[PDB]
Amino acid sequence: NKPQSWEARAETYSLYGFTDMPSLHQRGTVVVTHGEGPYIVDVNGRRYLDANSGLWNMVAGFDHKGLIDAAKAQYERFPGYHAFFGRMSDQTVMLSEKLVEVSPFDSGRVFYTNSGSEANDTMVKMLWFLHAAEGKPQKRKILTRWNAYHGVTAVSASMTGKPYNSVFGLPLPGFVHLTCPHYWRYGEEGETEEQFVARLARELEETIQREGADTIAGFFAEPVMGAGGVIPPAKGYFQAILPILRKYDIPVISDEVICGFGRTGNTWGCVTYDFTPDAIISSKNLTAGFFPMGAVILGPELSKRLETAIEAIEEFPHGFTASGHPVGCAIALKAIDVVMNEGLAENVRRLAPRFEERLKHIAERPNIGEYRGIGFMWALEAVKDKASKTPFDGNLSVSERIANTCTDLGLICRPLGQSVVLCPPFILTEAQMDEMFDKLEKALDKVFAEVA
Amino acid sequence: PQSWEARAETYSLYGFTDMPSLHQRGTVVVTHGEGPYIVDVNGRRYLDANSGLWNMVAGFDHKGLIDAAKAQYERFPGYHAFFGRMSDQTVMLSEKLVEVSPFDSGRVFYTNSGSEANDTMVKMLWFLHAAEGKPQKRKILTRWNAYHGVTAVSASMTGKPYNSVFGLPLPGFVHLTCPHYWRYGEEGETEEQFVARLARELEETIQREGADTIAGFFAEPVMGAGGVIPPAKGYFQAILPILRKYDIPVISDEVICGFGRTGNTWGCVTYDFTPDAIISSKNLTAGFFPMGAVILGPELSKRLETAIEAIEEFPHGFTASGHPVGCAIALKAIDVVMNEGLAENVRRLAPRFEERLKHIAERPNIGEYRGIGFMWALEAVKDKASKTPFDGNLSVSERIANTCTDLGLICRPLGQSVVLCPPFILTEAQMDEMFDKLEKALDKVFAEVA
Ligand SMILES: Cc1ncc(COP(=O)(O)O)c(CN)c1O
Ligand SMILES: Cc1ncc(COP(=O)(O)O)c(CN)c1O
Ligand code: NA
Ligand code: NA
C-alpha cells in the first residue's frame, strides 16, 4: 500500500511544522521543484509569485546564476569542514573579516551557527558564561518583547513572545516579555504615541527595578518585528529604551535575522533605527536562502570581555558540527556581494515609496485597520470595523482566506493573526510589484465582499 | 592583519579550541582536501583520522557528492517546508529515511543540526505528554559522559563537567551513571553486577522522580564525544524493559552511529534494541551540508499526529528545515555509504583496526582500547594495574595529538584518551599510515612523561 502522488508521499512520511493541518488535508501539500526570479513552480507546473521570498530569505530569487555559480565553485574547491580544534577553512576566515567590516562595528568577532534559533540560543549561553565569569552567576534573565520572534529552540522559543508556545510548557523561567511597541494595537484609548513610548520606558525601568539589574543578562530586539506581523516600533522607542538599558549594565542585542542586509532600506535595522547594539544576530539574507548559516557578530566591548573570560578557562566549550562550513561561508560572501553591490539593496530603497503608496490606497478600504512596514517588509491588518479597531471573529479566518484566495490567483502571501504580510525578493520589478498588488486586491475584494 | 593566522585571530571567536595551543601554534587554515587528506594554506597535507568531525565519511573531494550538490543548486537552490509547501527533494528524503530506518513506517521532521534535532525531540515530548493530559511529564533522562549538543537544552542533556560554565544543566535534566565499566565499575564489582546496578539505579531514579514526571530517555548507542564508549555487556537489554515498564519514550541519538560507523546502518541495530525515535545528522550528508533529522517510529508518529490534529498546527520549525539542497545531498550520501561499498569497507577493515589497537594496548601507558567498527579510542594511564591517569597538568592526550599533527596525522584528544574515527573510504595503506604516525607520537610522548 505505498503512496503514489507527490501529495500522498508527502503526507505518508512528513511531520509538518508551522503547517495548518485542516488546510493541508483540504488542499494537499504544494510540492515545489524549481523557481525563476521571484516565482516558484510546483509539480503540476503551476507558477506562483512568492511575495514572501520563501521565508524572508530568498532575496535574490530562486535561480540566481551568480549565487548558483558561487555555490558550485565552493563544492568543487572544498565541500565541507568544521571550525574546532584550532582548524578552520580559508572561507571561514574571509567571512569573519567581511562580517566585521560590513557590521556597524569598527572591530569585533564572529561565532557561527546554522540557524537564527541556534545563534540566539548561543548569544544567551555567551551572556550566562560572561556574567558568571565576571562574578555575577545570578545575571541570567533575558528581556524580549511580547510579539517578538527569536526562534524555536527551548531558549529561543522562551524569548519568542507567542501564545502558541504554551503547548510546550514554555517560556522557561528567566524569560521576561516587555510590552510590544505596536502603537496601533497597544496604545490605550486616548493615549498619544509620545505618551505610549514614555510608558514603555517607565515600564522597562520598573521591570528592571523589580527583577533586579544584577539578575538580568541581556535585552534582545528585532529592530522591526518580523513574525510578529511586520511591526516597526513606535516613534522614538529605541531612543527612550536604550539609555535605560545602558544605565543598568544590560547588554543590547539586535536580532538582525530578518533586518540584516537591506529589507528596512539599510544594511542593518539598527542603522535604520539609529542605535548601536553590543552584538548582532544574523541569518536568512546572509546566504540568500542558499545555505543554512547564522552568525553572532560581537561588538568591541563584548568581544574583549568574552576573550578575557575564555582565556581564563582556556577553551569556550560550545559549537555546532557545521559551524563555519566552507560552502556556507563562500555562499554568504557571494550573497553579501549580490545584495550590497548588484543593486538589490538599492532596489528596495528605490521601490519602497511606490510600495507604500499602493498600501496607503488599499488601506482606504473599510476592512483594513492599518498598513505598516518599511522598505520591503509590509503588512495589511484586517478589521470588521475601522473606527473601533474591531477584528473579525477568529473563526472567520479572514487572513487565511485572503492568503488561500491569493494562492488560487498565483500569489504567495503570508497570513499572520488578522494580517497579511508582504516581504518580496529584492529583485522584484515594478511590473511584478503591480502583479503582486493586483492579485492581493482581487483576493481582498473577494474575502471582504463575502465575510462583510 | 596580513597572514591567514593573524586574520583568523583578529575576527574569530573560537569554539571547542584550546586557546594556549592556538596562541602557540596558530590557526591551521584549510583550503581543500583529497580523499581522507586535508591540505592547509602552506600546502601541508594531513591524514584526517577523524573524518573532520566524524561526518566526512566519503572523504574531502568525493566526486559523486560534489556533482550531486552542484546538480541541486542548478535545479532548485533553496526553499522551506512550512505553510503546506515543501520541495520534491524533502518528500523524497523523508520516504528514503523511513525506508532505511529500522521502522516499518514513520515520519521525519528536519533540522540543521544534531543539537536542534535533540532540542526538537525534547519539545515534541513536552508537547505530546501535555496534550495527553500529563503536562508535568517533562524530565529528560540521559547519561553522564553523553553528548547530545550545545543548545541550552541539548547542553543540559550532555553530561560534561564543562557545562557548569553556562550555569547548566537546566532543572529537569537527569544524568544516569555512564555504562563505561573500566571507569565506573567499582573495586570488586563484576561487569554483570555493574549492569545490574545501573538497572537498579534507573528503577530507583524513576521511582524517586515519579514516572509521570519523566518525558523521555535518550541514548547514543556508542558514546562519541564521551570518548568512544561502547556500553557494558547487556546494558540496553537490562535498561529498556524498565523504561518500557514506566511509559518512558526511548530515543536513540544516532548522530554519530547512524549510517555505518558501528558496522551497521544504526547503532541501535548493532546493540539489538528498538527505539521509539532516531536522531540523525553528520553522515546523513557526509558533512557536505548542515542537516539533522528526527525519525519518529510508528507509535510516536501516531500519538504526535493525534496531538497536532487536535491543535491544528505544530508551531515549531527552522527556516532551513528540509532545504532541497540538503535533501538532494543526503539522498546521495545515503546512496554512497550503502551502495558504493563504504559501509562494507568499515565491516571489512574493523578486524585489522582492532588487531592493531590490541597490540598498541600492550604498552604500559595504555589503560585500554575500546570501540567498534570505525570508532575507537586508546586511554593513556601512568599506571596500568591501578588505572592511575597522568596528572591533568601533563596534558598527555593533547601532547600525543599535537605530535600527530607534526607528523601529518589528525587525531582527537579527549580527556586522557585519543580517538580515531576515520573516513569509510580509508584503504589498508592509509590505516597503516594512521597507526605508524600514532605509534611514533605515543613513543615520543610516553618517553618524555615517564
Ligand atoms: C527575527 C528572527 N530571529 C530568529 C529566527 C530564527 O531563525 P531560524 O528559523 O533560522 O532558526 C527567525 C526565523 N523566522 C527570525 O525571523
Ligand atoms: C551523538 C551526538 N549528538 C548530537 C550532536 C550535536 O550535533 P551538532 O554539532 O550538529 O549540533 C553531536 C555533535 N558532535 C553528537 O555527536
Ligand atoms: Na564594520
Ligand atoms: Na524502514
Side-chain angles (χ1 to χ4, degrees), chain A residues 115-117 120 149-151 222 255 257-258 283-284, chain B residues 318-319:
Chain A
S115 66
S117 293
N120 278 140
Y149 184 98
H150 298 289
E222 300 159 83
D255 181 338
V257 167
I258 287 172
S283 193
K284 288 189 188 283
Chain B
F318 304 90
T319 295

Side-chain angles (χ1 to χ4, degrees), chain A residues 6 9-22 24-25 28-35 40 50 54-55 57-58 62-63 68-69 71-72 75-90 93-94 96-97 100 108-111 114-115 117-118 121 125-126 128-129 132 140 149 152-155 157 164-165 167-170 172 284 289-292 298 306-307 310-311 313-322 325 331 412 414, chain B residues 4 7-20 22-23 26-33 38 48 52-53 55-56 60-61 66-67 69-70 73-88 91-92 94-95 98 106-109 112-113 115-116 119 123-124 126-127 130 138 147 150-153 155 162-163 165-168 170 282 287-290 296 304-305 308-309 311-320 323 325 329 410 412:
Chain A
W6 276 106
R9 288 167 63 205
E11 278 172 52
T12 300
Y13 308 109
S14 314
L15 202 290
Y16 297 87
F18 287 123
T19 298
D20 182 74
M21 300 312 292
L24 189 80
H25 291 310
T29 308
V30 170
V31 180
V32 181
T33 58
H34 65 285
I40 52 126
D50 192 320
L55 209 36
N57 63 339
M58 309 198 62
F62 304 103
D63 71 339
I68 287 174
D69 289 346
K72 288 165 76 180
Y75 276 103
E76 274 297 336
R77 177 181 176 84
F78 187 33
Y81 215 63
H82 66 262
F84 299 176
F85 320 122
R87 296 189 295 279
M88 176 174 287
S89 79
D90 57 340
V93 176
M94 38 218 312
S96 296
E97 175 177 67
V100 169
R109 314 287 181 279
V110 186
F111 192 90
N114 310 110
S115 66
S117 293
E118 283 168 343
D121 199 294
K125 286 184 73 193
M126 284 174 165
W128 289 344
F129 171 78
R140 288 185 66 80
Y149 184 98
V152 302
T153 64
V155 158
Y164 59 66
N165 283 325
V167 310
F168 301 110
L170 294 173
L172 287 176
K284 288 189 188 283
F290 275 49
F291 197 96
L298 304 156
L306 270 168
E307 284 185 333
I310 297 157
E311 283 309 321
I313 65 151
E314 301 178 345
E315 189 164 321
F316 181 60
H318 184 264
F320 300 90
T321 293
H325 192 110
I331 288 168
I412 305 289
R414 181 159 187 198
Chain B
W4 278 107
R7 285 164 69 205
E9 276 173 49
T10 301
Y11 308 106
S12 313
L13 200 286
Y14 300 80
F16 289 127
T17 300
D18 177 69
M19 300 309 294
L22 190 81
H23 293 312
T27 307
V28 166
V29 184
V30 188
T31 62
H32 68 285
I38 56 117
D48 191 318
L53 239 46
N55 62 342
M56 302 190 73
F60 304 103
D61 69 339
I66 286 170
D67 287 347
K70 290 164 62 176
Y73 274 102
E74 275 300 342
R75 175 183 174 91
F76 189 28
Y79 213 60
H80 66 262
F82 298 180
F83 324 119
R85 294 192 293 285
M86 173 179 291
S87 82
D88 57 336
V91 176
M92 294 156 83
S94 295
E95 172 175 71
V98 169
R107 317 283 184 280
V108 186
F109 189 97
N112 309 113
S113 69
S115 299
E116 284 170 341
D119 199 297
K123 286 183 73 190
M124 275 174 172
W126 289 342
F127 170 82
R138 293 184 61 84
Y147 184 96
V150 298
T151 65
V153 159
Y162 60 63
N163 283 323
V165 305
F166 305 111
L168 294 177
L170 292 170
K282 292 188 180 292
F288 274 53
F289 197 97
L296 300 162
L304 276 156
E305 284 187 328
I308 294 165
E309 289 292 319
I311 69 154
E312 304 187 324
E313 184 168 330
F314 183 58
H316 188 263
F318 304 90
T319 295
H323 192 111
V325 181
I329 290 172
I410 291 163
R412 191 193 173 169

Side-chain angles (χ1 to χ4, degrees), chain A residues 2 16 18 25 31 44-45 90-91 110 139-140 185 190 248 273 295 297 342 346 362 364 377 392 409 438:
Chain A
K2 72 143 72 266
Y16 297 87
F18 287 123
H25 291 310
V31 180
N44 301 121
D90 57 340
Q91 302 305 311
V110 186
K139 201 163 167 68
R140 288 185 66 80
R185 180 165 291 282
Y248 291 109
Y273 290 88
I297 311 158
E342 199 173 296
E346 187 54 36
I362 291 165
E364 291 167 21
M377 272 164 100
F392 286 109
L409 287 162
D438 289 346

